[PDB]
Design a protein around this ligand. Structure first.
Ligand SMILES: CCCCCCCCCCCCCCCCCC(=O)OC[C@H](COP(=O)([O-])OCC[N+](C)(C)C)OC(=O)CCCCCCCCCCCCCCCCC
Ligand SMILES: CCCCCCCCCCCCCCCCCC(=O)OC[C@H](COP(=O)([O-])OCC[N+](C)(C)C)OC(=O)CCCCCCCCCCCCCCCCC
Ligand SMILES: CCCCCCCCCCCCCCCCCC(=O)OC[C@H](COP(=O)([O-])OCC[N+](C)(C)C)OC(=O)CCCCCCCCCCCCCCCCC
Ligand SMILES: CCCCCCCCCCCCCCCCCC(=O)OC[C@H](COP(=O)([O-])OCC[N+](C)(C)C)OC(=O)CCCCCCCCCCCCCCCCC
Ligand SMILES: CCCCCCCCCCCCCCCCCCCC(=O)O[C@H](COC(=O)CCCCCCCCCCCCCC)COP(=O)(O)OCCN
Ligand SMILES: CCCCCCCCCCCCCCCCCCCC(=O)O[C@H](COC(=O)CCCCCCCCCCCCCC)COP(=O)(O)OCCN
Ligand SMILES: CCCCCCCCCCCCCCCCCCCC(=O)O[C@H](COC(=O)CCCCCCCCCCCCCC)COP(=O)(O)OCCN
Ligand SMILES: CCCCCCCCCCCCCCCCCCCC(=O)O[C@H](COC(=O)CCCCCCCCCCCCCC)COP(=O)(O)OCCN
Ligand SMILES: CCCCCCCCCCCCCCCCCCCC(=O)O[C@H](COC(=O)CCCCCCCCCCCCCC)COP(=O)(O)OCCN
Ligand SMILES: *[C@@H]1O[C@H](CO)[C@@H](O[C@@H]2O[C@H](CO)[C@@H](O)[C@H](O)[C@H]2NC(C)=O)[C@H](O)[C@H]1NC(C)=O
Ligand SMILES: *[C@@H]1O[C@H](CO)[C@@H](O[C@@H]2O[C@H](CO)[C@@H](O)[C@H](O)[C@H]2NC(C)=O)[C@H](O)[C@H]1NC(C)=O
Ligand SMILES: *[C@@H]1O[C@H](CO)[C@@H](O[C@@H]2O[C@H](CO)[C@@H](O)[C@H](O)[C@H]2NC(C)=O)[C@H](O)[C@H]1NC(C)=O
Ligand SMILES: CC(C)CCC[C@@H](C)[C@H]1CC[C@H]2[C@@H]3CC=C4C[C@@H](O)CC[C@]4(C)[C@H]3CC[C@]12C
Ligand SMILES: CC(C)CCC[C@@H](C)[C@H]1CC[C@H]2[C@@H]3CC=C4C[C@@H](O)CC[C@]4(C)[C@H]3CC[C@]12C
Ligand SMILES: CC(C)CCC[C@@H](C)[C@H]1CC[C@H]2[C@@H]3CC=C4C[C@@H](O)CC[C@]4(C)[C@H]3CC[C@]12C
Lengths: 204, 52, 150, 203, 150, 150, 150, 150, 150
């Protein structure tokens, strides 16, 4: 198990782990897990850690004939409807030659005291598509078993890990409510039909 | 090590709901059938009043 | 763009429009039928006159079918969530309205067939009630036509 | 009571599951997973609005049919010996049907407030659209259930008045008052629904 | 700003205030009416007096309406979660208090109307009991107002 | 620094206090009501004397109202989750204690008014039993106050 | 994009089409059978003429089989969730319409075969009502096709 | 690479294919059983001839078993989710069609075996009805195979 | 590696294979026992013969036991999720097929034991029916084994 990428400002602040980390340019794919987790010379320069804003910049020197830099930008703030600080990975920013490609990250959120884990935090539709864009982009990304904690990181250990994998999803919830209403209607209809009784006698 | 999270499958919602509702429906069907057989009319009403 | 599940709800609407309406009609066609079987032993000549409730129950089913078809012909692959839930609302409207109207028609016809057997003057009276019950289902259909074409 | 037993079993099992699930979520510090905000927000406003319209019409029709058959059975049973009932007591049926009419009207008044968004992000959908969906659902519930109860009540009173009419002609004219009272509830529901969707605007 | 979903609880408050109060009033009117109609054949001169319970049941509906109107007028798309919860509580309080008062009024009115058919002296007594049931709905209204205005 | 949904529970206290109590009171005012009617046919002179149960049931409602109003006056936008839980507990305590007391008062009052028509000496006995039932509701109120004024 | 679970609904379509229809047909074959057994004790000659309700229930089962096979012969591995939802809707419509039609045919056919032992003239009447029930299933089939062959 | 849970649905199919059908068969073999016993007291010579419904019910079980074995042989560690859903649907179809057919066979066989004691001419009629019920199970099996071998 | 919770399912298979079977057997025995009592009051000589149903019920339990033990011997800490599902399916199939066969044997044994007290010629028939019920459990066993060994 390769160790997590641990940015340090007097102590571990941003921990980033991924069973796989692959990136593609013009449909040309490449694996970065070996070049990312466990490498002691990782070009983490450009990272930053506010008290309430984190930027993890992983840079690779010869990638795709240029120095590429993936910046994961998260921010945690106090949400009034609770007393909890909730951190969300706001976006991803791929810097290539004098150029920037932005990816929105959809469902990477959770209490700032808990890391966030999600299988296939990827830009592919087949793999969740949490990295999404409306401007067509030449970049694609796949982080398999992506677990990140930017705030409240104590020591080398990820805190408990909220994850996108839930019991229900908006589509499942809508379908279940529709089916529940229609099951109520069908149960009413079937109860009234089953109450049908036939006469046991006929007039002389 | 590193307290890595449990590798939940991204489709957890789908399989959880599929299994939960399929098995709930199957259990309800089995219960209803077993009640319709257990509470079946004994069929010897022609013999209830002869034995009793 | 739109979620891949957006077409579910509309489809269910269509099916609901067919299912519940049919159930309604079925109940009517059952109850009235029972009543006719009870009436016809003493007053056979009234069988044809007393078949009106069943027909009205059938009409209810037709309404559902209409809406179902109207929704089953409008389901496109990229059906948006707005149209999907409009069709779901139309389906629920027509289906539950037809169910209730079929129950009312069945009960009223089962009573009125026997009543007309006893008192001929009740025949028209029975009809004057049945149509009311029937249009309840119609009202649902109307709203469906308002919804699925909003 | 076999079907009643099935319904009671389902209800008890569901609510015992809910109690245990709430206890587990609260106690294991997993309350943040029980986002009621996420449920109310991700769920499309279109679902709420269309369920509201469908209920506004369907529950009103259900109440109208319930009352119609409740009072029509009595009308056609009494009229075997006093056929005059069929002529005079149709008013009861009329009242029941009136319920359904309100339904469709409110359905229209609700269906006129619908409009697509072209947005999926809750910040993009916005308070206006979410409140429009919730208020259309609530108005549908109000009108549908008020009409259901009003129709059933008017049907019961009409059956009573038809049974009373079969034995004394001069009673219906004085019992119709009850029906009128029973009808008012329907109107009340409609009014409230109109007040709930007065300032509703999707888009 | 406030949450997007805040208005949901206020909407449900208005819906509950009207729906449950309507349920209570409808049950009270139905029970009282089916008692009054059955009495009238024996004691035709009492109907008018016996209409008093129905009126009381009707008043319950009014209470709901009143509170409903309040919640439907003080409910904007951007109300704080606190005010939305207050309106939900007011609606539930008025609706369910009116439901209980309507059940009590139906039972008491039916029984007292039949007793008056059999014992005129009971009339006044019935009224007292009806008031004691009617007041229950009033209590809910009070609380509802206190919650909805706050 | 408190959740904006904290007031929810507190509201569900107030609401509950006025709802459940009302339901309980209603049941009382219902059952006793019927009893009085049933016993008013033969013994009219006992109608006013036999109105004690209803009155006691009414008092139960008042208990709830009191607590409800108290809670409805202790609610605030920034109410802490702790105070909100206290108010929910007080509301449930008073409401369900009043519900149980209303059930007991209804049953005991119906039985007592029916018996006193046959056994005059039972009257005092009934009163005593009713008092005991009333005390149950009172207990709830006490606890509610202790919870609602911490 | 074409999720791994897209086929499930389509499968639950075919099963439904075969299951519910069968259930309906079974009911139609069961209830009617009892009636025939009751009627044939006194009127043996009508036993073969009175099997029409069983034949109509079998036709309902045949509708179910038709739609179930028409769905099972269209379940490709990468079936889009839209097409699988269409197949589920078709299966539900056909199956539950056939279930309602089976209930109607059971009640009507049993009542008609028992009455026809008393009044032969009811036979034609019964048949008409059975047809009005049978078409209900047919309606479902129609909609099912319109959905499945879309 | 396929999901590890994919096999689950598969086995359920098989299990269901052998459970529900079995249940149906049981009901058959139960109900007819009782009827046969009730017939034997008076007309013993009809025992063997009246074992036919039981045999029919037995055949239903065979269907289930067959399909179950099919599924129980088509299960593999890497069974795709699509094939697993297909097997679950085949199991559901065969099991529930056999359940409905077994219920129909039980009811019809009991009624007809009781009747054949009184009217021998009913025997053949009963047989036809049983076949019409039995074919229902056959239909399920057919669909099951179409789904299982797809 | 495999999930730590896999064995769970397999274990339940085993337990189910013994539980439901036992339940089935229990029912069978129970009913047969009752019948034998009612049979012994008048025909003591048939006390030992009329125990055949009980044996045929007991055998069903044995089936379950076999499968249970079989599954209990195939369990391992690192049992693949697919194998665990296979064993759960085998357990459910055997247990619920045995439950259905126990129902059938109980009803058939009760009826046939009571009948044979009056018509000795029915005894052979009873045996046949019992066999036709017992095989149902056997069918489950077969499927279970096919699932368990695989
Ligand atoms: C006329 C009406 C008759 C009566 C009513 C019966 C209707 C039953 C209709 C089928 C069930 C539908 C349930 C809700 C799901 C609707 C689909 C949907 O929106 O899903 C899209 C969603 C979209 O997902 P998503 O993208 O929103 O999820 C987020 C992303 N992931 C998934 C990666 C986390 O996908 C699914 O298909 C979700 C799975 C839902 C499956 C629920 C289980 C249903 C079980 C069937 C019933 C039991 C059968 C066995 C019975 C035994 C014999 C009696
Ligand atoms: C009988 C009639 C037919 C059935 C009709 C009623 C159907 C009821 C519907 C059930 C759905 C319930 C929602 C499931 C999701 C919530 C589960 C939960 O709280 O735990 C997960 C929550 C949240 O889990 P989490 O968020 O840590 O997990 C990570 C997230 N996932 C799993 C999605 C990747 O808490 C736990 O982790 C608790 C673990 C222990 C499980 C406790 C479950 C509670 C119930 C157990 C006993 C059963 C109750 C009934 C008793 C017997 C019958 C009366
Ligand atoms: C009389 C009824 C019999 C009692 C039992 C009723 C059935 C309940 C069992 C349901 C199946 C669930 C079994 C556990 C499954 C694994 C869950 C898991 O991973 O847990 C993680 C959960 C949640 O994750 P966590 O808390 O461990 O992780 C840390 C999370 N943070 C950092 C946020 C705190 O916690 C556990 O470890 C739970 C272990 C024990 C769970 C036992 C089941 C809960 C329900 C018990 C019954 C409740 C009522 C008790 C009183 C009854 C009296 C009548
Ligand atoms: C049967 C009739 C209905 C009543 C019983 C069932 C009610 C609930 C049914 C719906 C499903 C479960 C809802 C609760 C979901 C959990 C919410 C959550 O985790 O957040 C909690 C919230 C928030 O949790 P949190 O972890 O965010 O904590 C707050 C932390 N800060 C402030 C920093 C954000 O707080 C609560 O504890 C609220 C109380 C409700 C949760 C408990 C539910 C009770 C279930 C019934 C059993 C009661 C126990 C006593 C038994 C005897 C009763 C007389
Ligand atoms: C076989 C037949 C066909 C299939 C069956 C269809 C019919 C039955 C289905 C009806 C629904 C039953 C299940 C209800 C579950 C209640 C909530 C479960 C608790 C839970 O864990 O939910 C969390 C969210 O819930 C929430 O956000 C809470 C929302 C609760 C709303 C419940 C409203 C409906 C039910 C009760 C009312 C009924 C009346 C109708 C309104 C999930 O958390 P996660 O980890 O997935 O979250 C991910 C992001 N945070
Ligand atoms: C008399 C005593 C006998 C008892 C009676 C019989 C009862 C026996 C049990 C039957 C009911 C449940 C059977 C198994 C359910 C699980 C099926 C999926 C298996 C599973 O765990 O899948 C994982 C994914 O699951 C997921 O992602 C979701 C899994 C969650 C499923 C929850 C189902 C709810 C409960 C259903 C039954 C309720 C009522 C039953 C009567 C692995 O897959 P992976 O690829 O993730 O591998 C791991 C790497 N991540
Ligand atoms: C109590 C112990 C704990 C139980 C916990 C488990 C959950 C509950 C399961 C049931 C447990 C009790 C046994 C009841 C068996 C079913 C009901 C009785 C038998 C039955 O269904 O047959 C007839 C209905 O026909 C039918 O077979 C139709 C029923 C099937 C309809 C399925 C549609 C409903 C789906 C659920 C969603 C709706 C939710 C609504 C709240 C009703 O018999 P009878 O009363 O006429 O004759 C009197 C004797 N049977
Ligand atoms: C003795 C019996 C038990 C009595 C106790 C009451 C039981 C009520 C059952 C409901 C559940 C309990 C209520 C408290 C838990 C609410 C969920 C809190 C979890 C949480 O943190 O979610 C927030 C959103 O939820 C919220 O803020 C949701 C607020 C609304 C909660 C209450 C709604 C319950 C449903 C009421 C329906 C009434 C229907 C009437 C006909 C976060 O949100 P965030 O802003 O931090 O998001 C940050 C995203 N980046
Ligand atoms: C491949 C096939 C599908 C696989 C999935 C299914 C797995 C198995 C689970 C389904 C149930 C199997 C066991 C059969 C139950 C037999 C039902 C007999 C019904 C019966 O006669 O009992 C009635 C009571 O109903 C009752 O009591 C109802 C039965 C009891 C409920 C059973 C469920 C227990 C609860 C489960 C808890 C665990 C849930 C998970 C958290 C009494 O009839 P009467 O009322 O006339 O009585 C008057 C005389 N006493
Ligand atoms: C991470 O996944 C990559 C692919 O995204 C794996 O490498 C690929 O392996 C497949 C299968 O052998 C080949 O077809 C590809 O050409 C490989 N690389 C690329 C860039 O496409 C890689 O083994 C995985 N690494 C882990 C899990 O550490
Ligand atoms: C370590 O990473 C930094 C940050 O990327 C590299 O410095 C420059 O970073 C900017 C901002 O992303 C890029 O636009 C430049 O191209 C980077 N310069 C070069 C020369 O690549 C820095 O070079 C990295 N250091 C090492 C030793 O690899
Ligand atoms: C930040 O400090 C951490 C903790 O020491 C370093 O990461 C650990 O390094 C040790 C060896 O010193 C390994 O055994 C652990 O597996 C590592 N854990 C993690 C979570 O990475 C890390 O190298 C330091 N980072 C920098 C940029 O200096
Ligand atoms: C035993 C007999 C009575 C059963 C009913 C008759 C059978 C042979 C016939 C009647 C109509 C036929 C169906 C008609 C149309 C199609 C659509 C085609 O794409 C697949 C086959 C399918 C679905 C046929 C299957 C066989 C079928 C069901
Ligand atoms: C039923 C008659 C034939 C008696 C046979 C015994 C029954 C109970 C069967 C059921 C399951 C069987 C066991 C299943 C698995 C094993 C493990 C194997 O390595 C040795 C044999 C052994 C231990 C079997 C012995 C026989 C067994 C116990
Ligand atoms: C009740 C008694 C008389 C039934 C005995 C019949 C015999 C011949 C049957 C009953 C169950 C059968 C077994 C069922 C399943 C399996 C598992 C499979 O992987 C190999 C064959 C095997 C092991 C079968 C062999 C034959 C078998 C043992």
């Amino acid at each position: 198990i390769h160790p997590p990428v641990s940015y340090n400002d007097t102590a571990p602040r941003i921990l980033f782990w991924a069973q796989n980390f692959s990136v593609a340019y013009k449909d040309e794919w490449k694996d970065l897990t070996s070049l990312t987790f466990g490498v002691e010379n990782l070009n983490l320069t450009g990272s930053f850690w506010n008290d309430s804003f984190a930027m993890l910049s992983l840079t690779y020197e010869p990638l795709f004939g240029a120095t590429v830099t993936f910046k994961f930008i998260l921010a945690s703030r106090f949400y009034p409807v609770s007393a909890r600080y909730w951190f969300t990975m706001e976006r991803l920013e791929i810097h290539s030659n004098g150029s920037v490609a932005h990816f929105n990250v959809s469902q990477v959120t959770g209490p700032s005291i808990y890391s966030f884990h999600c299988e296939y935090v990827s830009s592919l539709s087949k793999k969740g598509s949490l990295l999404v864009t409306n401007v067509p982009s030449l970049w694609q990304m796949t982080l398999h078993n992506f677990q990140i904690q930017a705030f409240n990181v104590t020591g080398e250990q990820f805190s408990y890990a909220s994850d996108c994998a839930g019991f229900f999803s908006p589509g499942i919830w809508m379908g279940l409510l529709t089916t529940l209403f229609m099951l109520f209607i069908f149960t009413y209809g079937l109860h009234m039909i089953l109450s049908l009784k036939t006469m046991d006698r006929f007039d002389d | 090590p590193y307290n890595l999270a449990y590798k939940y499958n991204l489709e957890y919602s789908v399989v959880f709901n599929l299994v939960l509702w399929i098995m709930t429906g199957l259990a309800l069907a089995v219960i209803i059938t077993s009640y319709n057989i257990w509470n079946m009319d004994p069929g010897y009403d022609s013999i209830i009043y002869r034995m009793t | 763009n739109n979620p891949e599940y957006s077409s579910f709800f509309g489809v269910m609407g269509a099916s609901s429009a067919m299912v519940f309406s049919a159930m309604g009609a079925a109940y009517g066609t059952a109850k009235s039928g029972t009543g006719i079987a009870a009436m016809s032993v003493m007053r056979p000549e009234l069988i044809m006159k007393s078949i009106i409730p069943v027909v009205m129950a059938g009409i209810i089913a037709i309404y559902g079918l209409v809406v179902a078809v109207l929704i089953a012909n409008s389901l496109t692959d990229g059906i948006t969530l707005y149209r999907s839930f409009l069709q779901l609302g139309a389906g629920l409207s027509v289906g539950l309205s037809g169910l209730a109207a079929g129950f009312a028609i069945g009960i009223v016809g089962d009573a009125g067939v026997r009543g007309t057997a006893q008192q001929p003057r009740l025949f028209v009276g029975m009809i004057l009630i049945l149509i009311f019950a029937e249009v309840l289902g119609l009202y649902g259909l109307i709203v469906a036509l308002i919804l699925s074409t909003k | 009571t076999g079907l009643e037993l099935l319904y009671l079993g389902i209800f008890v099992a569901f609510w015992a599951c809910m109690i245990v699930v709430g206890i587990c979520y609260t106690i294991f510090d997993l309350g943040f997973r029980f986002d009621v905000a996420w449920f109310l927000t991700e769920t499309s406003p279109f679902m709420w609005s269309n369920l509201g319209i469908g209920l506004a019409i369907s529950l009103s029709v259900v109440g109208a049919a319930w009352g119609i058959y409740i009072t029509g059975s009595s009308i056609i049973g009494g009229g075997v010996k006093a056929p005059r009932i069929k002529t005079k007591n149709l008013v009861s049926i009329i009242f029941c049907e009136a319920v359904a009419i309100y339904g469709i009207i409110m359905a229209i008044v609700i269906s006129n407030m619908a409009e697509p968004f072209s947005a999926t992000d809750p910040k993009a959908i916005g308070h206006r659209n979410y409140h429009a969906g919730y208020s259309m659902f609530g108005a549908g519930l109000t009108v549908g259930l008020s009409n259901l109860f009003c129709g059933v009540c008017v049907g019961i009173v009409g059956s009573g008045a038809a049974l009373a009419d079969a034995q004394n002609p001069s009673l219906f004219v004085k019992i119709l008052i009850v029906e009128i009272f029973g009808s008012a509830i329907g109107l009340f529901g409609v009014i409230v629904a109109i007040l709930q969707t007065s300032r509703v605007k999707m888009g």
